[PDB]
């Protein structure tokens, strides 16, 4: 069992990848590499403010969003809408999956089932 082979099965679905910065990437997912290198397409990077007034946020990730090139210049919040982002795998903390997909079809490892039938 490697859950990366689970995650490769998704391949056309709106996910939200929450990275270790705090930045969250919402978008249609294309392929996933065997090191969890997500490639999303129609993405909407955003950085959630912490709802308490005095607390700032990540400052480095503010710089990273502006420097992507996609921040809307009139925009109030840190959002950056950009076609084609590519994400190196060690950055992903968690991936918010869609509500609709059935886990009990997808989590069946074909290779584990293959060996277990064979042996």
């Amino acid at each position: 069992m490697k859950l990366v082979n689970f995650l490769k099965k998704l391949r056309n679905e709106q996910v939200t990848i929450e990275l270790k910065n705090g930045t969250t990437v919402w978008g249609t997912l294309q392929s996933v590499s065997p090191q969890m290198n997500a490639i999303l397409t129609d993405v909407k990077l955003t950085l959630p403010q912490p709802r308490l007034n005095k607390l700032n946020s990540n400052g480095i990730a503010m710089a990273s969003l502006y420097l992507t090139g996609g921040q809307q210049p009139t925009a109030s919040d840190n959002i950056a809408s950009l076609q084609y982002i590519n994400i190196r795998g060690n950055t992903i903390r968690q991936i918010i999956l869609p509500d609709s997909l059935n886990l009990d079809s997808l989590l069946v490892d074909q290779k584990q089932l293959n060996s277990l039938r064979r042996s």
Binding site: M62, A63, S64, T74
Partner: protein
Amino acid sequence: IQVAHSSRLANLIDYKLRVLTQDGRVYIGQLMAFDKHMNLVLNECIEERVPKTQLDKLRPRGTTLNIKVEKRVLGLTILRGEQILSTVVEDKPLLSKKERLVRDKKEKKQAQKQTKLRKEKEKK
């Protein structure tokens, strides 16, 4: 600019990338090569960073924000993959896809001729 939906980092050779690193710095340059560890080689990449003084203009509240960005110029650098965080595409290649095809067929011809020559020369 629109990028093909099934375009992996092997397709995007000679496009102009926008690589983002962990310390908040953006590297912009023509992509030359990549590797298993995802460490790029960028041809005319120019580093940019947001200074700590300009940074509080990014914080959520004029209409458009204006950020003076400290940029250094470096050329033919190799990045290290450990630092890379995400890459975005900025500009298409110089040559068109058709014209790129023409160049590749030409180069295959010339290379095959040269190794045919080197073989027949080592025979005599």
